[PDB]
Amino acid sequence: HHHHHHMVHITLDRNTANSWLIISKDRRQVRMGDTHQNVSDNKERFSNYPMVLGAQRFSSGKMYWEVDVTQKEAWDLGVCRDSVQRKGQFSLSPENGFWTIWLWQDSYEAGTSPQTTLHIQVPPCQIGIFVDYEAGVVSFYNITDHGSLIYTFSECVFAGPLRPFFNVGFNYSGGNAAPLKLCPL
Numbered sequence: 001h002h003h004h005h006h007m008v009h010i011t012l013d014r015n016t017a018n019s020w021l022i023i024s025k026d027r028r029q030v031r032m033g034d035t036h037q038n039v040s041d042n043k044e045r046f047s048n049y050p051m052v053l054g055a056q057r058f059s060s061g062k063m064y065w066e067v068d069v070t071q072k073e074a075w076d077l078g079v080c081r082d083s084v085q086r087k088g089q090f091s092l093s094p095e096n097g098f099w100t101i102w103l104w105q106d107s108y109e110a111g112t113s114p115q116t117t118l119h120i121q122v123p124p125c126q127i128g129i130f131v132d133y134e135a136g137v138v139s140f141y142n143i144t145d146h147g148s149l150i151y152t153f154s155e156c157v158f159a160g161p162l163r164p165f166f167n168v169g170f171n172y173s174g175g176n177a178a179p180l181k182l183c184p185l
């Protein structure tokens, strides 16, 4: 892929974060805290899951960014509609406004309904995410394996502005404390 030149500087939006997340001063890293982080509740915060949005909103053009997932056992990454549900239980699916992949229990899957098995030979330490708004495309790349394609959502019906989407995952096991980090350009 030659998508690197549509690189965008993504930062995390504290106001959208689940109340147990800790976002770094530079707004480029997020991790699960071991407790509530002493913030007020608001209607933007994801209540049920350890999720947070990027601050950037996209309604046109081509955008690319990279996320470091080193040593995590579980995570979700991609984009979502600005208007996705924040409270209660929900599925990650395009019907609900999400275009995502994830790691869970030693398998990688795309957030279709139902979910799609991914075939990754080299476990990724960094994931590249490409959005073409006009084409209706969201693609995922394995930066650890020379940028190899992981998955393409096509014929996407975005139906509104898009935001970068992150889930650091729970840490029931004590093996998933590591952060998600936005990688430098």
Ligand SMILES: Nc1ccc(S(=O)(=O)Nc2ccccn2)cc1
Pocket (backbone or CB within 6 Å): 048, 049, 050, 075, 076, 089, 090, 091, 092, 102, 103, 104, 167, 169, 170
């Ligand atoms: N409906 C639902 C259930 C659990 C979760 S999760 O935050 O545990 N993260 C994930 C990620 C991939 C697979 C399972 N859980 C998110 C949404």
